[PDB]
Design a protein around this motif. Sequence first.
Motif, PDB file in Angstrom:
ATOM      1  N   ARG A  18     -59.426   0.671 -36.710  1.00 47.81           N
ATOM      2  CA  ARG A  18     -58.362  -0.446 -36.137  1.00 47.81           C
ATOM      3  C   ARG A  18     -58.788  -1.903 -36.803  1.00 47.81           C
ATOM      4  NH1 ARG A  18     -57.303   0.824 -31.372  1.00 47.81           N
ATOM      5  NH2 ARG A  18     -55.728  -1.019 -31.088  1.00 47.81           N
ATOM      6  N   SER A  60     -57.948  -2.074 -40.363  1.00 52.94           N
ATOM      7  CA  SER A  60     -56.487  -2.038 -40.535  1.00 52.94           C
ATOM      8  C   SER A  60     -55.923  -3.510 -40.122  1.00 52.94           C
ATOM      9  CB  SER A  60     -55.672  -1.162 -39.653  1.00 52.94           C
ATOM     10  OG  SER A  60     -54.479  -1.032 -39.860  1.00 52.94           O
ATOM     11  N   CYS A  81     -57.298   7.361 -37.377  1.00 52.75           N
ATOM     12  CA  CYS A  81     -55.843   6.995 -37.221  1.00 52.75           C
ATOM     13  C   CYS A  81     -54.876   7.407 -38.118  1.00 52.75           C
ATOM     14  CB  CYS A  81     -56.070   5.024 -37.445  1.00 52.75           C
ATOM     15  SG  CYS A  81     -57.318   4.536 -36.410  1.00 52.75           S
ATOM     16  N   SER A 131     -51.545   6.008 -38.697  1.00 52.18           N
ATOM     17  CA  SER A 131     -51.685   4.681 -39.418  1.00 52.18           C
ATOM     18  C   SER A 131     -51.569   4.925 -40.957  1.00 52.18           C
ATOM     19  CB  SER A 131     -52.566   3.627 -38.870  1.00 52.18           C
ATOM     20  OG  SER A 131     -52.560   3.543 -37.524  1.00 52.18           O
ATOM     21  N   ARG A 149     -47.917   3.527 -42.870  1.00 59.75           N
ATOM     22  CA  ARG A 149     -48.153   2.223 -42.742  1.00 59.75           C
ATOM     23  C   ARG A 149     -49.105   1.573 -44.076  1.00 59.75           C
ATOM     24  NH1 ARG A 149     -50.054   0.946 -38.299  1.00 59.75           N
ATOM     25  NH2 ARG A 149     -51.584  -0.743 -38.766  1.00 59.75           N
ATOM     26  N   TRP A 150     -49.983   2.409 -44.145  1.00 61.15           N
ATOM     27  CA  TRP A 150     -50.999   2.209 -44.995  1.00 61.15           C
ATOM     28  C   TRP A 150     -50.510   2.132 -46.582  1.00 61.15           C
ATOM     29  CZ3 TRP A 150     -55.833   4.716 -42.331  1.00 61.15           C
ATOM     30  CH2 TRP A 150     -56.028   3.908 -41.265  1.00 61.15           C
TER      31      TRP A 150
END
Length: 593
Positions: free
Chosen positions: A274, A277, A306, A309, A312-313
């Motif tokens: 996190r 990120s 994650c 996520s 979004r990456w």
Amino acid sequence: GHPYYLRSFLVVLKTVLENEDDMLLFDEQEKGIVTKFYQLSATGQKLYVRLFQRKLSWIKMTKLEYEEIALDLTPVIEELTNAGFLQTESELQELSEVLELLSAPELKSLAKTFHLVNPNGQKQQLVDAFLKLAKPGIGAVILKRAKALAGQSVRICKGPRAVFSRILLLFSLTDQLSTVLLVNLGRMEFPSYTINRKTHIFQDRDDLIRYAAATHMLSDISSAMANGNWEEAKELAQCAKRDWNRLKNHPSLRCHEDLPLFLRCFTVGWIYTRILSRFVEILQRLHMYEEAVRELESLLSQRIYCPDSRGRWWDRLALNLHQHLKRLEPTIKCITEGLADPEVRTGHRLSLYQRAVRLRFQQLPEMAVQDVKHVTITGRLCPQRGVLCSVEELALAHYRRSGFDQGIHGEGSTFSTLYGLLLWDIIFMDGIPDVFRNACQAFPLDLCTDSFFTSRRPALEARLQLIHDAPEESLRAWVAATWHEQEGRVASLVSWDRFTSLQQAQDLVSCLGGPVLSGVCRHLAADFRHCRGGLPDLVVWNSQSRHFKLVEVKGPNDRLSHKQMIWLAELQKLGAEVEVCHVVAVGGSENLY
Ligand SMILES: [Pt+2]
């Protein structure tokens, strides 16, 4: 008692001490700290918790006397000092800590004593000026004068503070993070469920220590960005990263991959991921579009942490490679393998496809969204500074005229409330390990994972079908049974104030009907966190025809995101009338400011 501090704190302790597995994460000296707290007078405790809940710093005695915590403070302070909980000005030695204690007028004087340029400037400017100037020892004179202005001061000792802080952390894993001391915890009633642990989240005391530390680091950085300190969020990321590259190879982390996702998020490796990120988000604001990519490839290169996520990456890897720039040759290299990633949700799949379309191979696939009905409405934008409402509140009025006398701007919450009312028994059912670990949860720990549905599949399949084929009368009955059984009170997935009355909830449910509710409930159980976000702004309905409309509101220069387009389509697919309601800023001629 017009604070709730001690009350909530005592409930926190009770909740955590109940689980003997958790208490083995503290040594004897640490549990000794907890015993000592109980041995303190009520007044010593009221003061300790008050100091404990606020952001850590020194406090002037005058400030404690003024806010009237006791008749004579001296014995209370001494009890706390003797017990090792509190320290006094004799241990106050860092110049910056002392300056922090000072009031604006006090700093202004110091500034005149030491001939600073702007004695009337901001407190923090003056503080920085003092610190910079502090290099018979001048810094010493400043320290001595400043200590003298400050007067008697106290500060809670960092040692016991950490014990309680870890206890507070165990109490609510990630579900401003200690606000729990601010609400009346003891008055809250939690659902009846059975605690049932099978799997340890933390190996030993050290594991909790490391996790607590990583948690504080992430929270410092998260807040820095929110205030807009982008420079001052970069360096701890790099401090983290240096530590991370050593930590990821630590033996304590090998057990964390054998944890289901819904427990794995409560481990260090998850916290660092996190961080990394957030780190990428930093570089993007700092136009350093080079280094972001290097970190995005490293995040994407792993599948332990994650997974939600991932979309979004990939989506940021592409946008960076596109307009940041070189070379346009390996963007589709990333878009194609992104579109192959099964963890990527429909919304990010669109943004990726929507960019691949921008063209001079390109084999597959087929991405297309059903269009929904759009509408334009008129309204009078109020000056940024200079009867009387918000964009959705406005729209609601339009639907009121248009025939929908009942309406709610609840966004996703209105449906997740219905969901909680119709699926209460399943949401809280026994027989699922690791999912209820203490007495103060508002949901099972796996609500938001694929594991929720798989662990409850037969009950959900039966129940979702029971709802789908249900007559309106039954639906009203079910909502009532839960409402009455949970006294419109127990703290959970259900927002008891989302509706005016049980009667209004029953009406909405009679309009939506079995099939629509079942489809939404199926979505909420299959992917809660993402379905909820994508549900539109309002639900409006006509009380006599039982007709209803789900409506997204978009103000001027507000845009339907990809995610929303998809969910409006899904709702329409279930047979719900769905509409985007645009608001056009228009002129008025009859009321100014
Ligand atoms: Pt903030």
